Amino acid sequence: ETKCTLKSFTVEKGIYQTSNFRVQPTESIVRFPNITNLCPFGEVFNATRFASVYAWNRKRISNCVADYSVLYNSASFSTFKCYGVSPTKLNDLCFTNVYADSFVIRGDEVRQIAPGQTGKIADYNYKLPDDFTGCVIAWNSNNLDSKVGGNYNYLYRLFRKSNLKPFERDISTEIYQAGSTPCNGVEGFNCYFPLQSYGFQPTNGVGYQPYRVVVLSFELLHAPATVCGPKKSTNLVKNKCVNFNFNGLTGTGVLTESNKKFLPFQQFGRDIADTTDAVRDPQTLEILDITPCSFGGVSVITPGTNTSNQVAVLYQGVNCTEVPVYSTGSNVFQTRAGCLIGAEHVNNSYECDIPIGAGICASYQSIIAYTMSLGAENSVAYSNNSIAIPTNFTISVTTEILPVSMTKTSVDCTMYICGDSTECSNLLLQYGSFCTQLNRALTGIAVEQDKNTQEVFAQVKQIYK
């Protein structure tokens, strides 16, 4: 990895930074309010009596938490098909409000409940709108309607030429006598009651047995959501790197107990910069903590490819007990600057060549990591009547290297970003005077370098030999 990040086949002595490591999460936890406001759907589908097809009852449902999965798997229904909405996902949908319409029909009238259809009851009693309807649920009711039901208690409307608008009722009981020219040229006659009675018998077939039919209509994006499906939950864990989804607030970290105190109306605390630091689970109402999972960069210390072929790897700022040949390797040495593995620890101290930090560094004698030494040690015998006077002298020569200039370079402005194109040059005109501004600085730098060299070297007016 060091050779990869260096892009060379030779590595000199020193310490390099290759990559970084993080602790992966293990499982997930999701929580939601302990209570669940149940919606009384029992009184709708299991009502004692239903109205007629021409006078269906409409009932209003809102501020409910209704589950459709508990009803989807029920086999007590003859047919449950929904238009444009997947029932299985209805548990994860929020709608503004819901309208319910329960009634009873004959056996063969089930197919009449569909948008864009033609029929006596489809156009004369209840018309589905030319859009998406929630859906229709139908089931057999011969036990309570075809055996003990009223013989004429169920009525339909044989009133034609009166196609009703969707979601409209005409319960006006008016005798259908035109009383004008377009009825046999007589007034009063041809009078037929708008209503007529179903003809049913106990187990008379399949198309005549009354069936319970309920239409549920949803509204979406008309108002703030009032009805939503229930959401599941799970238990909690401690001292583990977990991703959490506490009632909308999502994140990752490790959970610990806390001693902070919340007022009875807050939900989650913080310290600064929108960093959540304490959340309370709705079920237990206990205060908790959030701590980011440990991570950090790694480093490789090597004495050089030439001398040896052994390295030591160090994790920076990690109290490495969750360390997963060098997965554990040699003795682990935890220091003030993380932890090092691959080098034994000695008890003496010498001069330092490859610094690590916190006063410690490693060198190749195997690789040994020790504490930096400040140098030699001596004590001068100070007195109040003693001096030391030198008696001999030496002359020494040293060296001192100082840079004075760097290579002068220039970069073409339009050539770099255009590559000899007319369209690029034409569209570069709309960005203002960036080009000249970028081009001037390099020339200024080159002039400065020339002046710098000339000033630093030219200090004599003549030439001596």
Binding site: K260, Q266, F268, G269, D271
Partner: protein, 216 residues
């Protein structure tokens, strides 16, 4: 009559706990050192415009101020909010009601056409209320603990904590207080910027205006 509101009208803006942090927010607050229309309805409750949330206060420690009827026309044509007291529970009814000349309440009812929603919940005393309507949500903040810094005037620093929230989503442009048959302040609020100081326990202990004084 006019009264000078010294420093009242600061409430918790959100549901976030904080400690030992100076937080600057931009929200609808009551401006410091403002004027409030002192009323003396004692032997007189005219209709006052809503205008984007209203402050409310009282100083009588008994059940005489009962309800606050809301709406845009105060007739059965449009739905009208009603929040009334019972000395044992508080009931809220948004269902449409007809006009009333001199309503009487204490421990009026005209019609209930197209009923839609219902809600049931649980020196003298000061009752401070703040009514707000934002993105179709109705919010009521309340404080019931009085402090006698000065007498006959509401001086002192006190915070307001939320109680309920209603997802009604209706237009409110008119409201009226309800009385019985036999001294409350009203103020308007503006979108100001405030600085708030939190204690170590998360309680607001000091507030500073940001558009009042050069020192501010």
């Amino acid at each position: 009559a006019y009264t000078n509101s010294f420093t009242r009208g600061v409430y918790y803006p959100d549901k976030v706990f904080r400690s030992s942090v100076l937080h600057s927010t931009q929200d609808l607050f009551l401006p410091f050192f403002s004027n409030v229309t002192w009323f003396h309805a004692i032997h007189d409750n005219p209709v006052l415009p809503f205008n984007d949330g209203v402050y409310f206060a009282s100083t009588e420690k008994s059940n005489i101020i009962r309800g606050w009827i809301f709406g845009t026309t105060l007739d059965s044509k449009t739905q009208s909010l009603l929040i009334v007291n019972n000395a044992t529970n508080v009931v809220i009814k948004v269902c449409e009601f007809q006009f009333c000349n001199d309503p009487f309440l204490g421990v009026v009812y005209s019609s209930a056409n197209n009923c839609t929603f219902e809600y049931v919940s649980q020196f003298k005393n000061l009752r401070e209320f703040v009514f707000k309507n934002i993105d179709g949500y109705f919010k009521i903040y309340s404080k019931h603990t009085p402090i006698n810094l000065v007498r006959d005037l509401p001086q002192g620093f006190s915070a307001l904590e939320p109680l309920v929230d209603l997802p009604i989503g209706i237009n409110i442009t008119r409201f009226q207080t309800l009385l019985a048959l036999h001294a409350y302040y009203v103020g308007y609020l503006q979108p100001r910027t405030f600085l708030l100081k939190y204690n170590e326990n998360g309680t607001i202990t000091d507030a500073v205006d940001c558009a009042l004084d050069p020192l501010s």
